[PDB]
Amino acid sequence: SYLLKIKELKEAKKEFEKIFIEEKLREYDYDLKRTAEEIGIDLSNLYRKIKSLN
Amino acid sequence: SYLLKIKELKEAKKEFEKIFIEEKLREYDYDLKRTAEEIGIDLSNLYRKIKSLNIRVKSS
Ligand SMILES: [Zn+2]
Ligand SMILES: [Zn+2]
Ligand SMILES: [Zn+2]
């Protein structure tokens, strides 16, 4: 809920995307191929997010 | 919690953006120009999102 207390839209969208993807890894057995396929994006894409956020 | 339960990333991002903007609109009493500046985007952009995300705007 702290997300709604963030000022900038673009900051709040990253923080959310970081939480969503990290909370996703834990519920998908930290597998990139699996996670990427099941959150609806590519591997090269998910990988380029894992570094830009985590 | 509504959000984390969402399957796809592109869909959960839209729902968060919708909720984020709704609440920012509320706390700035639906002053569009002020809301846009506060959250770091152009009014024209904020308005595109308002329409795309199907957000209701009140206050006179
Ligand atoms: Zn800042
Ligand atoms: Zn599945
Ligand atoms: Zn301000």
TrEMBL record, chain A:
Superkingdom of this protein's organism: Bacteria
Binding positions (Zn(2+)): 8, 11
Protein name: Transcriptional regulator (NtrC family)
Species of the source: Aquifex aeolicus (strain VF5)
Full-protein residues shown: 383 to 436 of 442
